[PDB]
Amino acid sequence: VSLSPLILRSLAELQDGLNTVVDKNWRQLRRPGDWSLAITMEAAELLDSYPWKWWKNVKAQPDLQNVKIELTDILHFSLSGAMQVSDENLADFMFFPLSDTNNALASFQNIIRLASLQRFQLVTSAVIAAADDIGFNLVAYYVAKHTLNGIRQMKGYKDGTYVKVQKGVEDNELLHGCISPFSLDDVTNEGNYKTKWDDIMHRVYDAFGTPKEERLNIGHWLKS
> Which segments are annotated as binding site?
15, 19, 42, 45, 53-55, 70, 73, 149, 152, 157, 164
Helix (H) or strand (E) holding 147: helix 138-154
Helices and strands per DSSP (H, E), number in the chain: 10, 2
Q: Give the residues across from 169 on adjacent strands.
A: 166
Whether cis (ω within 30° of 0) applies to the bond prior to 51 is: no
3-state secondary structure labels for all residues of 67-89 = HHHHHHHHHHHHHHHHCCCCCCC
Q: Given the complex with ligand UMP, which of 19 and 124 has the nearer CB atom?
A: 19
Helix (H, G, I), strand (E, B) or coil at 50: coil
Q: Which residue is nearest to ligand UMP (CB)?
A: 76
Interface pattern 34-73 for its own copies (x via CB under 8 A): x-xx--xx--x--xx---x-xxxxxxx-------------
Going through the chain in order, the beta strands assigned E by DSSP cover 165-166, 169-170
Q: Given the complex with its own copies, which of 57 and 89 has the nearer CB atom?
A: 57
Q: Which stretch binds its own copies (CB under 8 A): 21-29, 87-95, 176-184, 202-210?
A: 21-29
Binds 76: which of ligand UMP, Na ion, its own copies, none (CB < 5-8 Å by kind)? ligand UMP
Site for its own copies, rule CB under 8 A? 22-23, 29-30, 33-34, 36-37, 40-41, 44, 47-48, 52, 54-60, 105-106, 109, 112-113, 116, 153, 157-160, 162
